[PDB]
Structures are given as C-alpha cells and as structure tokens.
Amino acid sequence: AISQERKNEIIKEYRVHETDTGSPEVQIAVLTAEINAVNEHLRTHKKDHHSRRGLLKMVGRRRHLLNYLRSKDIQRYRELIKSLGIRR
Amino acid sequence: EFEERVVTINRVAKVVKGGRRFRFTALVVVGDKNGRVGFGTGKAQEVPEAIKKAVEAAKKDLVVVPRVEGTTPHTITGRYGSGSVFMKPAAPGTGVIAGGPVRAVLELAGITDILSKSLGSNTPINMVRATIDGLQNLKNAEDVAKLRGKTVEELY
Amino acid sequence: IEIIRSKEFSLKPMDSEEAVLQMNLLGHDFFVFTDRETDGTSIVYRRKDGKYGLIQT
Amino acid sequence: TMTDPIADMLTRVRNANMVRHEKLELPASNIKKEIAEILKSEGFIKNVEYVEDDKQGVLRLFLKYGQNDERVITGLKRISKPGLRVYAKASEMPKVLNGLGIALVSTSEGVITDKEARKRNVGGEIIAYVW
Amino acid sequence: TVVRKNESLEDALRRFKRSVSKSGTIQEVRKREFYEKPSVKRKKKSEAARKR
Amino acid sequence: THIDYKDTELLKRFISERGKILPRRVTGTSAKYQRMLTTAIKRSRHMALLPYVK
Amino acid sequence: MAVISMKQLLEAGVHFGHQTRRWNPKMKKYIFTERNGIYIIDLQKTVKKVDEAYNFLKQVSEDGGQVLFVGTKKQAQESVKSEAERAGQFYINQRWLGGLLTNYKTISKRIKRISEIEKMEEDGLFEVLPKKEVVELKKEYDRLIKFLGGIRDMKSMPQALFVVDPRKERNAIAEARKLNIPIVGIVDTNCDPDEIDYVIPANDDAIRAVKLLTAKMADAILEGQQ
RNA sequence: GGCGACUUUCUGGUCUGUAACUGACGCUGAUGUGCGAAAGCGUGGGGAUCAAACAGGAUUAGAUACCCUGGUAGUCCACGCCGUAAACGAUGAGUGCUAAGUGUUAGGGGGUUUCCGCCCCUUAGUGCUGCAGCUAACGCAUUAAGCACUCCGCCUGGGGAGUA
C-alpha cells in the first residue's frame, strides 16, 4: 500500500482535532491515496485480478462513507470534493 | 375393563428361497372412555391370537388424557415424523368428527365432541402415534396453575 | 530384532489393598498405582517367593 | 447486525429452557426489560434482575421449573416480526391456548398481558405467545 | 553411495539393501511408472497419510 | 529466533544422508520452524553450501 | 448414628473419580474439583445423598419388599454376594442374562428347573443314566447357578434394584425404567445420573469404595424389618 | 476457479492484542457490472515429454475397444474471445443462542521455569468423535441438516426437454 510516513502525513490535513483518526473525512482521504496507488499498480499490471477486488471493495467502503457524510452535514461533503478531486 | 378395537390387519410376506412367509400383523387401540388410552402392535400368524398379542402390548403403555368434560382442554397439533393430526375443542353437542385411524384413538377416551383433521401423511401406524403424542402434550387448567404459581381464577 | 509389546496403563490413586484386588482380577504379577496417602508412585508385585513386594519409585 | 432484538431475547429463553438452565443473561432494552418483568408477574420465570452496565446494561432471568423436573414455559413463539408486523384490535385480540397461555401485546399504555388488554379495551401490536 | 569394505559381498548387500529402502529411489520410480491424474495423487497421498 | 542460511552446521543436521530433507515427523521440530527452515535450506542449495543430491 | 462419618468415608477412597478426557458433563453437580487429570467427587454432597439413599431403603423393607443387588464389575463381583446374604436379598455375580426382569416368564421357567434338577439326582433316576448324560445334566446344573445363582429362591418381581455401575450394567437399568421400578446406584464420572432416581456419587474402581459403601445400603434394610 | 523451485520489485486480504478515535456509518442485494478448471476458437510464437484423430503389429469368438510401436491438432507462452463442469460440503449470505471430549494451524495472557520444554485459560481457523434437538431414514450435531430473525436465488408428478 502506502508507507506510514505517507499515511501519517495525509491524516494531518483532514484531521478535525488532534488525535481524531477514524473520522469519516480522515479515512476517506487515506482511501483516495490507496485508490490512486493501487490502480497505478494495476495500470501497468493489467492481469492482476486478485488485487482488483481489493480495489473494488475499498471503492465501496469509500462510497458508503461519502453517502454517510451527506446524511448529517452537506457542507462538509462539499469541502471534501473540492479538497481532493472526486466527481459526484 | 379395557375396550378392544382394531385399526387394520396387514398381510405381509418376506421373500424366502423356498416358500414365502405368512405373517399377519395388526395394530389395536385400547382405552376406557374415561381419560386413559393406549395403542400397540402385534405380530403372529393365528389372527385372533395376533389381535390379543397387540392388546396386551397396548396394556404396558397407557397415557392419561386430561379433560375439561365432553371435549379436550385446548388446541394442539400432534407430530410424529410425517403424521400430524389437528385437535380443536368443540361444543358438547357436535359429535366427534375424525378420519379412519384417528377416530378409534379418540372414541376410546371419552370426548365425543371435537374438531379434528389428519394433516400430513396417511399410514395408520404413524397417525395413531402422532395422536397419542398430541394427547401426551395436553395440559389441564388446574395443574398449570400449580406450576405457574397462580390459581385457576387468577389465570383468567 | 526383539519386539517388546507395550501395554499402556493410566496411573491412578488407590490403597495398597485395592492394588492387590485389581492385580488379582487380571492375574498380573505387577500393578503400578499412586499411593492414596503417600502420593508417590508405587509398584505392587508378586515375588519369586509367591509373596507380595512393594516398590516405591 | 442482528435484526430483531426481542426475538433474539425470546430464543435465548427457549434454548436455555431446553437444556434445563436456570440462569442466563441478555443484552437488554426497555421492552426487553418490561417483557421480562411481565413474565415474572404472570409467573413463568422466578425473578428478573438489575440493569447495571455502562453500555446497554445486562439483565438475568432465573427460569422456573416444576417440582417433578418439569418446565413451566413449554413453547414460546414470536408472532409480530420485521417484514410482517401483525396488529390486533381489542375485539379480535386472541386468546392463547384456550385462555391458558398468555399473549403480551404492545399497546398505547406500555405492554400488557392477554388478560389485561380486553378489560382495558385497547389493542395494539401483538408481540409474542408465551405458553 | 556408501563404500563397504573389509568384509565379504554377502554383508555389503545387507548394508546396501537397507541403504536403498531408506531412500526415495524404489518408491519414487514405482510412483512414476505412469502419469496419475492431478487430483488422484492428492487422495493417494491422503490414503498414505491417514493410515500412517 | 530465525534460521540464517549461512549457518551451515545447524542446517546440515537437517539435510538427509543424500541431500534430501528430513520431515518434521522424524526430526521432531515444530511447524513454523520447519517451514522457516525450508526457505533457508533451499537458499543454501542455490549457493552451493549444500548439494541437491550427493 | 445416621450417616457415614467423614473420616472412614474418604479412607475408602470414594473421592476419586474417573479421568478428565473421560467425563460426563451431567456429573458437574457431584464433582468438587480436578487434581492432576482426575476428578474429585464432592464429599460433603454425597453424604447429603447417601442419607437419602438410607431413608427410602429403610422403609422399602418395612413393606416387606425384595431389593435386587447386581454387581458385575470384576473388582466388585463378590463384594455384593456377601452383602446380599447378610441382607437376605437376591444377588447377581455374573453377567446380566438378558431379560431376568422382563422376560422372566421364561427365566422362572428355569428357576423351576434349578428347584427340580438338584432334586432329580438326590433321589434316584441317576444310576440308569449314561455316564456322559450325567455330565451334561451337571454341566447344565452349574451354569444355572453361575448366572441364576442369586435368583435361586426368588420367584416374583423385585420392588427396588441396587446397581454398582450403570455403565457396565446398562442392560439392567433399561429394564428397570420400563417396569417403573425405583433405582438406586453407585455412580461417578462416566455415568449418567438421569436414569438413576436415587443417586450415590462414589468411586467405582476400588474395593473399599464399594465394600465400605455397599455394606451400609445392605445394612439399610435389616433395621427396616424390625 | 484455484495456488508448490528460488530471489527482487509492485500489490490485495485475513487473524491476534491494545484500547486512542468516528459514532449505526450496518446486513442482504433483483436489473447491472466483473472474475471463472479443463476442452475449445482467433491472431501470432514456441514445440521437450505426453497425446485425441490417424497408421501399423498382436489379442479375441468378433473390433473402431483394451495392449504395443509411431504420430498431428492440442498440452506451453502473449493478446483477445468463449462463460460452461459431479464449478460438490450435491448444503445462499448475515447475526445471535444451545452438553462435552479430542487432534492440529496462526496468535495472545498466565503459571512454573525449561537451560526454548510443558501445563491451564482465551481468540480465529481446520479436522475426528458425540448429547439435547432434528430427520422419511441414512445421518447432522458451536464448521447444524438444532433453536430464531432479515434478505436473495429456486422447486411444486415422470417423460416430451433444458428440446421447438
């Protein structure tokens, strides 16, 4: 995946307050790092199908948290789409 | 004193290298029209001796049938394998309505007024045992209040 | 070669009188048990004498 | 992700009854507490106990058995359920086992027994059959 | 591959007959006398292990 | 501990009298020791510290 | 006085049970603890059971009934014959014959024989017989008193039964529950207490655990007579 | 489905323990969209063994079978297809609850201490026995085919037929 110093870096910007990892927008950002890391691996390795349902599962766990985040505050959802580029 | 009643006699032969066999078996229902009924089977070759083999075999297993008078206490379904009878209480002037084998196990205890229908399978061995197993699991109003700890008027 | 047939037994606590009883009920010349009061492993055996001997291990 | 709480309560009670257990504990609720409170008032269990823990405090049941090693609750059936909720008016509010067993019913007064719903003339969601 | 000397030939055979039986030569080439199916040796090894 | 693939003397008591592998049935080692052994016995076959057959 | 005292009860060694890995989970009530692969039977609670075993067996013989004693475990065979003679009851040493409580309309057919075959050679009708027919008439004679030796003078059904082990004598206990005969027995680990109505938790593979426990139950009927 | 030399790079999942954090974010899932043994098919490679078809020699009462010699596609790789198997634990997924005994795999906490070896408890796998309960019977039985609740697929006589 990604290294811990890469992983601990990306939980600094989207953190809401100190020692609050596990927040929805701090575990969507680390997914979007892991999404973009593995389909770059999968771009040059097109035959790796067992790693593809690892991608397709964590696509699903990112979508279920974006759909969760709209249900309690919409204005936080609009900020995350602008901060890191997602469609929809 | 007991009241004998047959259900059916069967003509069964097991294949032998020489001459085949002549076993005539029969199941009977034995009751006293007061709340105590048992069944049993008997295998012999002399047919009136094959009956009395099944009558004495019924004598070792008599089940006490609880009763609010002229009917059964509550609504049950008996189960034994595939046979399954239904048993609804009735008014005391309806007449006991039942099938072939289940009428004999219902007349031999004194009820004479209940709704019934033999669901499931059909063979007379199983539905007479799936009725006894139904009548095994009946409860009076007075003995439940002994277990539950209330009185007969507190249950209502 | 010589093949020694093993007879497995599970060690159990009892009186010496009990060990004599159980040994006779099998006719075995050796019975090994843990002594009920001493707690140690004991072997009751029949000597070449015909009398009993008791070994503590 | 168990999807019916007070049916999971009701089969804990049946499975403990089958093996002659006399003591089990539940992840409790209000309706779990007050169904278990209504079985001791009708007299199926011996005594329910306290609710203590920080999250969803447990409670213990103490089943009650006959003196000839018989069991009191013989059969226990959840009738209303998710997907098909059954509701009963007070007119056709049914007697269980020809009036022998009971039927605890959630009405708009808190849940009450089979007896206590007709003379109160209220109906509601009929929860289960206890016999 | 064991050298046996300072004796006769009818005693070097007794070494060599058990220095081959404790080796994967005779039980190996008897296995590969014919191609077995790739899921019947998994049961052949299972029968040669459940009996021990 | 962890088996290093250069430590030949403790690693060649596990090789056979021809170069095969003794099973853990006859040696007596544990499960995870045997397969941490076998990835070290086969890196030592590759760099000629131990043969394939003798 | 009333019960066995605590000293001689554990001196017989009844606190020992069978091995752990050889355990019946229904015997959890009558087990104190585990000590080095063996179970320890609850010694205070079996005193609260052997007095209850003493209470009814007192008053069974008050009615004049006949209590059957059975013992077939090889280290407890002749510890039940000597206690049945002191009690004046009927014993079993050898194996269960397979119907001596249930098909005993064909067993008393042969208890009629043992009342006859020993009469057959004390009088005449013995010199005229062939010398090998003398053998099989005597080879029948000992094999009757092997199995039915303690049922020599018993001509009716019993009213209680006393077993040393429900495991090895499971043929007897299955005939007991069909006849509704009350049952009392020595159980331990690897024994089911469900089929026994009157439970005595005690050791079973020791002689003093039998003999210093089966004697008082044999003594329990004597002061129920008078 | 499957996966067996070894090394490196790239990458997916599970389990254990701690409790910091988020605060029902969950489960199932029609249509849809992707993986899917072998044998096949396409475009090229490569072709050692093995080997349908095929050739020849024997056997037999007879052969196109079995057996033997030889042998092409195939078996192998790369890219597109095909999408079917007794694809089977003939058993959908999820979460609870209900005697025990016993192997073994991956941990953890203990207790002695072992001079690295055991013992007890617990978690997640994987087997073998076996109560209650269940089954039509075989059997299943904390890895249910037991007791429950949710949702999805599917059956309702045998042929005709998985055929028009």
Q: How far, in Å, are B44, B45, B125 from residue B23 at the CA level?
A: 6, 5, 17
* DSSP per-residue codes, chain A: ---HHHHHHHHHHS-SSSS-TT-GGGTTHHHHHHHHHHHHHHHH-TT--TTHHHHHHHHHHHHHHHHHHHHH-HHHHHHHHHHTT---
Beta strand B76-77 pairing with B83-89: antiparallel
Run of H or E residues at G217: helix G207-219
- Terminal alpha carbon distance of chain C: 30
3-state helix, strand, coil in chain D (%, to 5): 25, 20, 55
Q: How far, in Å, are B3, B50, B82, B105, G99 from residue B41 at the CA level?
A: 16, 9, 19, 14, 21
Q: Where are the domains positioned within chain G? A: 29-96+160-226, 97-148
DSSP letter assigned to residue D84: B
3-state per-residue secondary structure call for chain B: CCEEEEEEEEEECCCCCCCCCCEEEEEEEEECCCCEEEEEEEEECCHHHHHHHHHHHHCCCCEECCCCCCCCCCCEECCECCEEEEEEECCCCCCCCCCCHHHHHHHCCCCCCEEEEEEECCCHHHHHHHHHHHHHCCCCHHHHHHHHCCCCCCCC
> CA G164, G166, G172: angle at the middle one, nearest 5?
95
Residue of F nearest to E22 (CA): F17
Q: Please, are residues F18 and F54 in contact by the beta-carbon 8 Å criterion?
A: yes
CA atoms of B70 and B114, how far apart (whole Å)? 9
Cα torsion through A32, A38, A43, A48, rounded to 10: -140
CA atoms of G132 and G214, how far apart (whole Å)? 42
Amino acid sitting at position G68: L
Q: Where are the domains positioned within chain A? A: 1-88
CA atoms of B64 and B109, how far apart (whole Å)? 9
CB atoms within 10 A of CB B20: 9
D6 touches strand H (CB under 7 A): no
D100 touches strand H (CB under 7 A): no
Tokens describing residue D48: 């329910």
CB atoms within 10 A of CB G151: 24
Exposure string for B36-71, b = 16+ CB within 10 A, e = fewer: bbbbbbbebeeeeebbebbbebbeeeebebebeebb
DSSP H helix total and E strand total for chain C: 1, 4
CA atoms of G102 and G105, how far apart (whole Å)? 8
CA atoms of C7 and D29, how far apart (whole Å)? 60
Q: Please, are residues B72 and B86 in contact by the beta-carbon 8 Å criterion?
A: no
Helix axes D5-18, D31-42, angle to 10 degrees: 40
Interchain proximity C18–G74, CB inside 8 Å: no
Nearest residue to G206 via CA among G178, G220, G186: G186
Chain G closest-CA separation from residue C46 CA (Å): 19
**What are the backbone angles phi and psi of residue G63, rounded to the nearest 5°?**
-80, -10
Q: Please, are residues B51 and B4 in contact by the beta-carbon 8 Å criterion?
A: yes
Tokens describing residue D54: 């920080």
**What are the backbone angles phi and psi of residue B43, rounded to the nearest 5°?**
-110, 120
Q: How far, in Å, are A2, D100, D110, G33 from residue D104 at the CA level?
A: 57, 13, 10, 44
* DSSP per-residue codes, D11-61: HHHHHHHHTT----EE---SHHHHHHHHHHHHTSBS-------TTT--EE-
DSSP helix/strand/coil, E14 = helix
Nearest residue to G138 via CA among G114, G169, G154: G114
Question: Does chain E reach chain D with at least 3 CB pairs under 8 Å?
Answer: no
Class of residue F22 by CB neighbours under 10 A (exposed 0-12, middle 13-18, buried 19+): middle
Beta strand C30-35 pairing with C41-46: antiparallel
Longest distance between any two alpha carbons in chain A, whole Å: 42
Amino acid sitting at position G49: K
Q: How far, in Å, are B127, G15, G207 from residue C12 at the CA level?
A: 54, 12, 14
Amino acid sitting at position D117: A
Which residue has its C-alpha nearest to nucleotide H135's C1'?
A: B81
DSSP H helix total and E strand total for chain G: 8, 7
Run of H or E residues at D87: strand D87-88
Amino acid sitting at position A11: I
Q: Please, are residues D115 and D95 in contact by the beta-carbon 8 Å criterion?
A: no
DSSP H helix total and E strand total for chain E: 3, 0
Q: Please, are residues A9 and A29 in contact by the beta-carbon 8 Å criterion?
A: no
Run of H or E residues at G10: helix G6-11
Residue of D nearest to B142 (CA): D100
> CA B28, B34, B36: angle at the middle one, nearest 5?
50
Nearest residue to B131 via CA among B141, B117, B110, B144: B117
3-state per-residue secondary structure call for G33-87: EEECCEEECCHHHHHHHHHHHHHHHHHHCCCCCCEEEECCCHHHCCCCHHHHHHH
Amino acid sitting at position C16: S
Rg (CA), chain G: 20
Among left, alpha and beta (phi > 0; psi -120 to 50; other), residue F50 is: beta
CA atoms of G27 and E33, how far apart (whole Å)? 59
Q: Where are the domains positioned within chain F? A: 1-54
Sole residue written with tokens 């509601």 = D124
Exposure string for D34-44, b = 16+ CB within 10 A, e = fewer: ebbebbbebbb
Residue of D nearest to B150 (CA): D43
CA atoms of D72 and D80, how far apart (whole Å)? 23
What residues form DSSP beta bridges with C31? C44
Nearest residue to B150 via CA among D36, D43, D68: D43
Beta strand D128-130 pairing with D76-78: antiparallel
Run of H or E residues at D130: strand D128-130
Class of residue F32 by CB neighbours under 10 A (exposed 0-12, middle 13-18, buried 19+): exposed
Architecture of domain B76-147: 2-Layer Sandwich (3.30)
CA atoms of D98 and D111, how far apart (whole Å)? 21
Amino acid sitting at position D44: F
Q: Where are the alpha helices (DSSP H) in C1-57?
A: 16-24
Nearest residue to G56 via CA among G154, G156, G159, G195: G159
CA atoms of B41 and G150, how far apart (whole Å)? 35
Task: For residue B22, give every residue at least 6 positions away whose Cβ sits within 8 Å of its Cβ, in sequence order, or none.
Answer: B13, B45
Q: Please, are residues B79 and B108 in contact by the beta-carbon 8 Å criterion?
A: no
What residues form DSSP beta bridges with B30? B4, B38
CA atoms of G47 and G36, how far apart (whole Å)? 24
CB atoms within 10 A of CB F48: 8
CA atoms of D9 and D3, how far apart (whole Å)? 12
Q: Please, are residues D105 and D125 in contact by the beta-carbon 8 Å criterion?
A: yes
Task: For residue B72, give every residue at least 6 positions away whose Cβ sits within 8 Å of its Cβ, in sequence order, or none.
Answer: B87, B89, B111, B114, B138
Nearest residue to B43 via CA among B53, B58, B57: B53
Q: Please, are residues D28 and D51 in contact by the beta-carbon 8 Å criterion?
A: yes
DSSP letter assigned to residue E3: -
What residues form DSSP beta bridges with C44? C31, C54
CA atoms of B125 and B29, how far apart (whole Å)? 11
Nearest residue to G186 via CA among G219, G170, G209: G209
What residues form DSSP beta bridges with B26? B9, B42
Task: For residue F44, give every residue at least 6 positions away whose Cβ sits within 8 Å of its Cβ, in sequence order, or none.
Answer: F5, F6, F8, F11, F50
Run of H or E residues at G199: strand G198-201
Which chain H positions come under 7 Å from a protein C-beta?
Answer: 1, 5-7, 10-13, 20-22, 24-27, 34-36, 50, 79-80, 94-107, 132-133, 135-137, 146-151
What residues form DSSP beta bridges with G220? none
Q: Which residues of B touch D97 (CB under 8 A)?
A: 74-75
* PDB resolution in Å: 2.9
CA atoms of G220 and G218, how far apart (whole Å)? 5
CA atoms of G188 and D86, how far apart (whole Å)? 52
Interchain proximity E23–F54, CB inside 8 Å: no
> CA D101, D104, D109: angle at the middle one, nearest 5?
145
CA atoms of B41 and B6, how far apart (whole Å)? 10
Q: How far, in Å, are B62, B91, B94, B98, D102 from residue B105 at the CA level?
A: 12, 20, 18, 10, 30
Amino acid sitting at position G202: A
CA atoms of G144 and E37, how far apart (whole Å)? 64
DSSP letter assigned to residue G160: E
Q: Which residues of B touch D66 (CB under 8 A)?
A: 147
CA atoms of G176 and C40, how far apart (whole Å)? 42
Interchain proximity C21–G13, CB inside 8 Å: no
Q: Please, are residues G27 and G189 in contact by the beta-carbon 8 Å criterion?
A: yes
Sole residue written with tokens 């059957």 = G68
D2 touches strand H (CB under 7 A): yes
Interchain proximity G38–C13, CB inside 8 Å: yes
3-state helix, strand, coil in chain G (%, to 5): 40, 10, 45
Beta strand D105-107 pairing with D124-126: antiparallel
Amino acid sitting at position A49: H
Sole residue written with tokens 């009946």 = B138
Q: CA neighbours within 13 Å on the CB side: how many for G25?
A: 1
Tokens describing residue F26: 């006859």
CA atoms of G164 and G168, how far apart (whole Å)? 9
> CA G59, G61, G63: angle at the middle one, nearest 5?
80
CB atoms within 10 A of CB C14: 24
